[PDB]
Design a binder for this molecule. Structure first.
Ligand SMILES: [Mg+2]
Ligand SMILES: [Mg+2]
Ligand SMILES: [Mg+2]
Ligand SMILES: [Mg+2]
Ligand SMILES: [Mg+2]
Ligand SMILES: [Mg+2]
Lengths: 125, 226, 212, 233, 222, 195, 204, 196, 196, 195
């Protein structure tokens, strides 16, 4: 066994494109529409609950997720990838911030941590 | 330290004194010993003060992540299990002695936890240097089917026994009431029976009393423009 | 503690600090480390404070009994040896004593005896005892001469305690000066180290390292 | 220097308006072994004093003989031995206190904590403590060993200072003592259910009660307690 | 192993005035984290206008006081009812303490009264009998909390006269008995707040040419 | 080893270090140089446990020489002293700590100032006009406190140093076999061969 | 032997009306031997001030560590760290060395730049936070400081009055401690000005 | 602590006192020392409370995972898991555990695991500080194939004596009955057993 | 060692095992631990053999000299002499002695004197290392005013159990019967008491 | 104290004893005479624990002086050494033994012979041509073994003694502040004031 894929699966093509990132963006394009609007005294995020079946309970599938008491997230694209990112985002808000400073991270820094996780899946083996 | 926990009709109450000490010296005269693990799960700590605060924040942090992961409100038994397995792993070197109390979908709960990782169940419990003074009161006045008002009275009376009779305990009584189907109400400084009397004299000095060698402005601001 | 005593042309200078500590806690700044055995004899106190007080007061009683019986002033040699023989009987029991027995008689002249709780008894010209002894020795050794004036000798003893008071954490408070002559000792006052330090710094130009 | 072998636990006591109450259980422990169940640890001296003793029982028996000998000696050439020149609580205590401190000073202590309870000639309440170190103190409530930690807090709720003593009746005082003995039985691992209680009143004299038991105990709530955390059955 | 010593806590304070002296001490008696008594007198009138307290291990404290009171009695018998002067009492106490040099009374002793010129006097002793006349001396548990405050407020240490900026010290003006008692009460109130062994009650013995007077004050009981 | 002294005067730093090396009963050497040149204008003297002293000194030397080559630049005395402190501070919580006390005498060519740093085995750094380690200060500091001036010449500094050594030779029980004296200034490091 | 009392020294912090004050002695020693009279124990990162008593090597190390951490904080957060936040950082950093701790007694002091609220805090060597309203004390004369502060302190003192109170608290406490003294520094901190004053004291 | 397990005709009964001490202070006077590792496999705990709780929790986990895969475990299997933990970690444990269970095939079984981590299958077992005082009584009074009522009386009388003499034991006498019929909890208070 | 003394209707009976060990080696397997200090005052010895022999010899001397002057001593008097020696020399003794005697006025009496040197008058007493295992049995089975045969059976059964569990006890069970009729020695061998 | 040496030549005994007195950290004296004249032709040097040394030496002195007066006669060096040995042999099993080592250099006027006796604190007596106590012998005995002759003059003995002291000053870690040298011969006891 062992993970013998210790090399990058995303690489620069001759034209300078990173194929797997572009293809990931194509997968996002196929995904259901979600949006965000910022007001003076608040922010709103919204999306469609595209139910795969009417027998399915769409309330159990949360597309909009609480990350911290003051931060929320919504997505477009592959749901399972989102779900694990929310788990990692919630944990990293504690491990790399709340357990150090005794308070929840500001939006931009939590976003920065999420961005870092996504960057690493673009370069790691 | 004197900390107690008391079960009642529709929930549980915990209480604590507010004196933290360094040997025989009182470091803080109004310490907050009632800590929050989750909104409706609270605990009081005795022993090594850093260990009690550190272990409640860690388990409280993991409890929050667990609550988010499972989409369920946190349970006291989960806090209990996580605390005891952590403390057991460190074999008493983490000197945390806790009374854990709270409400959850299963009901109301009251546990004690010792530094080596052992846990106990009870309707009334006491921990800390004033635990014997407090337990004497609890053993004298506790009964089954206490009301909310009776439990708060009993709990605070048990802390008072520690405050007056135990040198390790003093100052004020903090209380937190966790009732089923309700928000937990934290009652900071529920009792204040130890206010210092006015001093005989004011020790405000005349300005210029202290001898000074040098003065200077300290630059706290960043490097300036232009 | 810092105590010193040295012989010179004009007799003996005795100088001591005034600090008493129990660990890091400064118990007192006004402690007397010169025991006035009698009007002619002085003793310094280092080590055990009670042991030095008790037994040097007792020594005064023995010296008084001697001159009543013999109709003659006791010699510094004899007085010092009464104390050293006494503490030697107690050797092992845990007495803690380091003292200079100082006096000025006809037959001996100015004489200093270092007496110890181990039973050591040493005659000498310069002695320094205590936690700050090394600091005082430096100032003494570099500035000492037999032909010092009483004024300069008094200052040297004062300055040497100041040196120790500054550097040694367990020395300070104030300086007590004595001048021992043949006709008896003469007290030369209590000098607060706090006030003395700044005074000496300015007038002497020393302690440039310290900001004043 | 020794170590205690057969030991007695808490002695508890308090002042009330007309006198003093003192109590102690009837156990002589041998380490964790509850060896002897019929040990009287309250020893009356005359009709005005009761000495309560905890700690080493062999030393208690020695002290018991000293007090017995003290009564004999006081009667010698003393026509007023049963009147003006009878033994006072204060005399008995000072004697014991002298002995205890002398013995600690020879590095061979009587390994005990003692409470002398009684009423003086003028009707004053006497209650004072002495132990193996010769340390003495007086208080409206006094207790030894575990009693100090658990009984005193309860007894001090009745008589918190000197001014509460005249307000406290013998019925209230006895009730508090009996409750304290129950609490000690719940919580002291070296205690027994059986105890003795002595009241020394300036009007009704010495009332010595033997073979008392802790009663009205709460245990029913134990049935509901299951496991140590997660267990339901 | 048997330990012949113990710590009964407590804190005492002696202050010498111009024509008076006070010796104060809290009335709390303790072992470890338990209170033995909220009122156990610690400062004693020993006769001949002398007040005494031997703070630390209470059994040795009581023993010493008892032996000194006894010494006052026998001083009267042996020397035609002569008054024992405070300096003579002090030297006598040194010998009582040094008598047990190799098995000491585990106490810090302080006595107070008037000297033979009628001025206020306080003497301070270590456990083995080294002693000294002092103007100001706190002893016991909260001594380290009280002495710095007294250096500042009685002797005006580190205090200078405004405008001069360190050049002129604040003058050492004499304090009245009412002024001293204020500093004593504030010393014990502060010590009670920050030291667990201090509290319950404060008993002050004031010595003047008229005799010995007592004053009692409540302290916090926690 | 035993005695190491340091004094910063007007335009130079002077380090005096004992020559004796004693292994218990016998004095094995009476000409030992307890110092290493870290850079052209930075000298470090040292004293402590046997082996650790030289091992540490040479390790520091190698690291500073490596830095000098990499950057083609001499680190300031302050920078070198901070590096050394960190190594000792790292060392004190190691499995087996370096038992070494050092003085760092350097001339800062940028600021045109002499600089003396005293660092003990715990990583306790202090910048001083004069310094010592072990018992050396107990004997010498009273003399230095008295005579020292910040505007002293190199020759005056050496005279005050002789007085310190004389006091040591008088009152110290151990025979430290005299001292090797070295001067650090703008022109670099040189040894005073007659002392 | 005891690491917290080898080098000696003290720090005290007090709150006043719209101001805080933090002060320290200047002594560094090797037990009985005085080594330095310029060893300052107070540091600042932006407007947040940190005093540290105890083992001097750890005082230096922790200062360098918190400079390091507050500099990275500022670069990422794009703002200076606040006293409340820094207090939690000090606590976290100390507790991560739970079974091999820095032998120190840190003291945080400052004013929150947004709320304007005066803030002080103290810690044990292992990270336990003491957030007192009135005053925080630390060092080898902490008992002496507790005694001085408890009697001298009163709430809502003006900056120039607070200076006198904290100065006298430090000075007289240090004079009853063998391992403290050799000079002293007092910081008077207001929302947008900080004054630093070196005190004249006895040098023994 | 006073604990015991006794096999009888219909199965097995576990018995225990309820006292937990810290020195001479009774930290808990209503402790439950009879703990469940499986439906009809229980244990009695003596020694370090932290250790025996930690062990019991791990065993319960192992038997739960065993049951998910291989169905109901035997009492012997439970005892083996206890032993494995106690034996391999003997240097860091202070645990004296009695394991008792009911199979339909094997019926009532009792295994005792003392400090060393050895295993001993017995008709009945006694353990804890208070057991020392009842070795004589239990050996004289135990019979095989007793009835439920006789076994309850045997345990009640035995632990009554252990409690009477051992200061570390006391409180209520808890019992758990394991048979084909199911699991029955019993409790007996001081006023009942002290007069025996 | 396993020793006991039991009062009954006609007087008192002393009982003891016969094992004396040096570590795990049985130095003497036929020891007589029932020793005579007077005609009808005997004692059971436990602890240091040297100490208890030395004490018993001194007591016998004291009671012999007592008898020469004041006539036959009471059992209480004998116990007092034992106590005086054990209490005053408690620092240098390791002795646990049970004193048993028969007067005509007082009949059978038993006094136990443990390590500390205290005295306890009891209806019956048990002592020695093996006594720990029979506290439960003896407490349940003892009755006052038993017959000679019942008391012999009680002691035999009790010491049988003490011997069974205590490695420091063993050999034969010796007994001495003290009544108005006189002094009777009894012995019971392993083959007899082991099958009980 | 530290170093005491002895050498018996043709017609005299020479004792060399160090001048230093060290109390832990400081050298309190550098002119201490570690010897007592017991009789006109008998000298005793001594080294050991502080206090005990002088107390013992003076006690012996008093006893020999008492004997001299009572009998109007000087005891032989052998007789004095036997008396001293017995006192030390008595001392070693006492409650608190004298921790003192001595050399006894005497001239026997009857036999016209110099005599050197070495006695340690246990009461171990040996008559020797040359002797020492403590570590002194470790450094010096190889030189004495090589150069010593029984027919040496006093001047040659002093030269060999200088060589021993030079070797001590080179290889010993402690500074013993030189030695006081005394000669015992038919004319009595005299001190060599320049050494
Ligand atoms: Mg004498
Ligand atoms: Mg309290
Ligand atoms: Mg100083
Ligand atoms: Mg023996
Ligand atoms: Mg056997
Ligand atoms: Mg020899």
């Amino acid at each position: 066994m062992t993970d013998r894929y210790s090399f990058s699966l995303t690489t620069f093509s001759p034209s300078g494109k990173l194929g797997q990132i572009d293809y990931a963006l194509t997968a996002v394009k196929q995904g259901v529409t979600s949006l965000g609007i910022k007001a003076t005294n608040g922010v709103v995020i919204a999306t469609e609950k595209k139910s795969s079946s009417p027998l399915a309970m769409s309330e159990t599938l949360s597309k909009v997720s609480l990350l911290t008491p003051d931060i929320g997230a919504v997505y477009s694209g592959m749901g399972p990838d989102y779900r694990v990112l929310v788990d990692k985002s919630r944990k990293v808000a504690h491990t790399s911030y709340k357990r150090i400073y005794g308070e929840y991270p500001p939006t931009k820094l939590l976003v920065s941590e999420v961005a870092k996780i996504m960057q690493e899946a673009t370069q790691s083996g | 330290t004197t900390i107690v926990g008391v079960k009642f009709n529709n929930g549980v109450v915990i209480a604590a004194d507010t004196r933290s000490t360094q040997g025989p010296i009182v470091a803080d005269k109004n310490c907050a010993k009632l800590h929050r693990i989750s909104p409706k799960i609270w605990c009081a700590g005795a022993g090594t003060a850093a260990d009690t605060e550190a272990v409640t924040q860690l388990i409280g942090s993991n409890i929050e992540l667990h609550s988010l992961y499972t989409s369920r409100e946190p349970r006291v038994v989960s806090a209990l299990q996580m605390l005891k397995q952590h403390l057991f792993k460190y074999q008493g070197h983490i000197g945390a002695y806790l009374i854990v109390a709270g409400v959850d979908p299963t009901g109301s709960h009251l546990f004690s936890i010792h530094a080596h990782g052992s846990t106990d169940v009870g309707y009334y419990l006491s921990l800390g240097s004033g635990s014997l003074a407090a337990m004497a009161v609890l053993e004298s006045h506790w009964k089954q089917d206490l009301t909310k008002e009776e439990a708060i009275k009993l709990a605070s009376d048990a802390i008072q026994a520690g405050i007056w009779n135990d040198l390790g305990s003093g100052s004020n009584v903090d209380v937190c009431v966790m009732e089923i189907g309700k928000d937990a109400e934290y009652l900071r400084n529920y009792l204040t029976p130890n206010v210092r009397e006015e001093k005989q004299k004011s020790y405000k000095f005349p300005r210029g009393t202290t001898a000074v060698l040098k003065e200077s402005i300290v630059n706290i601001c960043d490097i300036q423009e232009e | 503690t810092t105590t010193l005593a040295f012989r010179f042309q004009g007799g003996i200078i005795v100088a001591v600090d005034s600090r008493a500590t129990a660990g890091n806690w400064v118990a007192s700044q006004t402690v007397k480390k010169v025991i006035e055995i009698n009007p002619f004899l002085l003793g310094t106190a280092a080590g055990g404070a009670a042991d030095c007080q008790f037994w040097e007061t007792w020594l005064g009683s023995q010296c008084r009994l001697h001159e009543l019986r013999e109709k003659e002033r006791i010699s510094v040699a004899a007085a010092s040896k009464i104390l050293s023989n006494l503490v030697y009987q107690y050797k092992g029991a845990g007495l803690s004593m380091g003292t200079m027995i100082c006096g000025y008689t006809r037959k001996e002249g100015p004489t200093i005896y270092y007496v110890d709780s181990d039973g050591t008894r040493l005659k000498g010209d310069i002695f320094c005892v205590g936690s700050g002894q090394t600091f005082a020795y430096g100032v003494l050794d570099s500035n000492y001469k037999w032909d010092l004036s009483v004024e300069d000798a008094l200052y040297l003893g004062k300055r040497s305690i100041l040196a120790a008071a500054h550097r040694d954490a367990y020395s300070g408070g104030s300086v007590n000066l004595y001048h021992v002559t043949e006709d008896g000792w003469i007290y030369h006052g209590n000098h607060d180290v706090g006030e003395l330090f700044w005074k000496v710094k300015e007038e002497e130009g020393s302690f440039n390292n310290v900001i004043g | 220097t020794q170590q205690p072998i057969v030991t007695g636990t808490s002695v508890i006591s308090m002042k009330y308006d007309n006198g003093v109450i003192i109590a102690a259980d009837n156990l002589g422990s041998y380490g964790s072994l509850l060896r002897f169940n019929g040990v009287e640890r309250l020893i009356p001296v005359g009709d005005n004093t009761v000495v309560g003793i905890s700690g080493d029982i062999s030393d208690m028996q020695h002290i018991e003989r000293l007090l017995k000998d003290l009564v004999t000696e006081n009667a010698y050439d003393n026509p007023l031995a049963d009147a003006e020149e009878a033994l006072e609580p204060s005399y008995i205590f000072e004697y014991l206190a002298t002995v205890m401190y002398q013995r600690r000073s020879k590095m061979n202590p009587l390994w005990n904590a003692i409470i002398v309870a009684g009423v003086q000639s003028n009707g004053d309440q006497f209650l004072r403590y002495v132990n193996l170190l010769g340390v003495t103190y007086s208080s409206p409530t006094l207790a030894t060993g575990f009693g100090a930690h658990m009984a005193n807090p309860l007894l001090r709720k009745v008589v918190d200072r000197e001014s509460d003593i005249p307000k406290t009746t013998v019925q209230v005082a006895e009730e508090a003592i009996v409750n304290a003995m129950r609490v000690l039985y719940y919580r002291d691992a070296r205690s027994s259910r059986n105890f003795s209680l002595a009241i020394i009143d300036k009007n009704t004299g010495l009332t010595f009660k033997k073979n008392l038991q802790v009663e009205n105990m709460k245990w029913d709530f134990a049935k509901d307690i299951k496991g140590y955390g997660t267990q339901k059955i | 192993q048997f330990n012949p010593y113990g710590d009964n806590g407590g804190t005492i304070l002696g202050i010498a005035g111009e024509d008076f002296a006070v010796l104060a001490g809290d009335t709390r008696n303790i072992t470890d984290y338990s209170i033995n008594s909220r009122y156990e007198p610690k400062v004693f009138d020993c006769g001949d206008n002398i007040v005494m307290s031997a703070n630390g291990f209470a059994a040795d404290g009581d023993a010493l006081v008892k032996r000194f009171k006894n010494s006052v009695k026998w001083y009267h018998f042996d020397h035609n009812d002569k008054k024992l002067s405070i300096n003579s009492a002090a030297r006598n106490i040194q010998h009582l303490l040094y008598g047990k040099r190799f098995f000491p009374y585990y106490v810090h002793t302080i006595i107070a009264g008037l000297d033979e010129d009628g001025k206020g006097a306080v003497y301070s002793f270590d456990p083995v009998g080294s002693y000294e006349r002092e103007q100001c001396r706190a002893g016991g548990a909260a001594a380290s909390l009280i002495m710095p405050f007294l250096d500042n407020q009685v002797n005006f240490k580190n205090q200078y006269e405004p405008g001069t900026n360190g050049k002129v010290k604040k003058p050492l003006k004499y304090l009245s008995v009412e002024e001293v008692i204020k500093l004593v009460r504030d010393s014990f109130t502060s010590a009670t707040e920050r030291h667990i062994q201090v509290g319950d009650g404060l008993e002050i013995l004031i010595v003047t040419k008229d005799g010995v007077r007592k004053e009692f004050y409540e302290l916090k009981r926690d | 080893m035993d005695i190491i002294l340091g004094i910063r005067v007007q335009d130079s730093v002077i380090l005096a270090s004992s020559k004796a090396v004693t292994r218990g009963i016998s004095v094995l050497k009476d000409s030992d140089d307890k110092t290493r040149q870290l850079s052209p204008h930075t000298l470090m003297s040292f004293a402590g446990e046997a082996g650790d002293t030289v091992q540490f000194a040479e390790y520091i030397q190698a690291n500073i020489q490596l830095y000098s080559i990499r950057e083609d630049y001499e680190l300031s005395p302050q920078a070198v002293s901070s590096f050394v402190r960190q190594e000792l501070a790292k060392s004190i919580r190691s499995r087996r700590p370096y038992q070494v006390n050092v003085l760092i005498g350097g001339y800062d060519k940028k600021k045109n100032k002499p600089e003396l740093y005293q660092i003990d085995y715990l990583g306790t750094k202090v910048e001083l006009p004069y310094g010592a380690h072990g018992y050396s200060g107990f004997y010498t500091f009273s003399l230095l406190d008295h005579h020292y001036r910040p505007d002293m010449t190199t020759e005056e500094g050496l005279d005050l140093l002789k007085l310190c050594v004389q006091e040591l030779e008088k009152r110290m029980p151990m025979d430290f076999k005299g001292v090797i004296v070295k001067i650090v200034d703008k022109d670099g490091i040189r040894q005073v061969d007659d002392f | 032997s005891d690491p917290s009392s080898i080098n000696g020294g003290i720090v005290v912090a007090m709150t006043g009306k719209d101001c805080v004050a933090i002060a320290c002695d200047l002594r560094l020693g090797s037990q009985s031997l005085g080594v330095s009279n310029k060893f300052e124990k107070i540091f600042h990162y932006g407007h947040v001030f940190l005093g540290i008593t105890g083992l001097a090597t750890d005082v230096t190390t922790l200062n360098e560590m918190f400079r390091y951490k507050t500099n990275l904080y500022k670069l990422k957060e794009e703002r200076a760290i606040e006293p409340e936040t820094f207090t939690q950082l000090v606590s976290s950093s100390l507790y991560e060395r739970r079974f091999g701790p820095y032998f120190v007694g840190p003291v945080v002091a400052g004013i929150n730049s947004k709320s304007g609220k005066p803030f002080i805090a103290g810690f044990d060597l292992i990270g336990c936070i003491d957030e007192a309203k009135d005053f925080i004390v630390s060092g080898t004369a902490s008992d002496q400081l507790f005694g001085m502060c408890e009697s001298l302190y009163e709430p809502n003192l003006e900056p120039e009055d607070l200076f006198e109170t904290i100065s006298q608290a430090l000075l007289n406490a240090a004079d009853r401690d063998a391992l403290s003294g050799w000079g002293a520094v007092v910081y008077i901190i207001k929302k947008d000005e900080v004054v630093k004053r070196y005190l004249k004291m006895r040098q023994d | 602590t006073s604990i015991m397990a006794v096999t009888f005709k219909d199965g097995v009964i576990l018995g225990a006192d309820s006292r937990t001490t810290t020195g001479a202070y009774i930290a808990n006077r209503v402790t439950d020392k009879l703990t469940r590792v499986h439906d009809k496999i229980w244990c009695c705990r003596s020694g370090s409370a932290a250790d025996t709780q930690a062990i019991a929790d791990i065993v319960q986990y192992h038997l739960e995972l065993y049951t998910s895969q291989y169905g109901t475990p035997s009492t012997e299997t439970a005892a083996s898991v206890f032993k494995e933990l106690c034996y391999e970690n003997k240097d860091n444990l202070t645990a004296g555990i009695i394991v008792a269970g009911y199979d339909d095939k094997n019926k009532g079984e009792v295994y005792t695991i003392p400090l060393g981590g050895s295993v001993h299958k017995l008709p009945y077992a006694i353990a804890g500080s208070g057991s020392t005082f009842i070795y004589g009584y239990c050996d004289k009074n135990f019979r095989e194939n007793m009835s439920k009522e006789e076994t309850v009386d045997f345990i009640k009388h035995s632990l009554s004596q252990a409690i009477k003499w051992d200061g570390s034991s006391g409180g209520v006498i808890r019992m758990v009955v394991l048979t084909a019929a199911g699991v029955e909890r019993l409790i007996f208070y001081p006023d009942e057993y002290e007069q025996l």
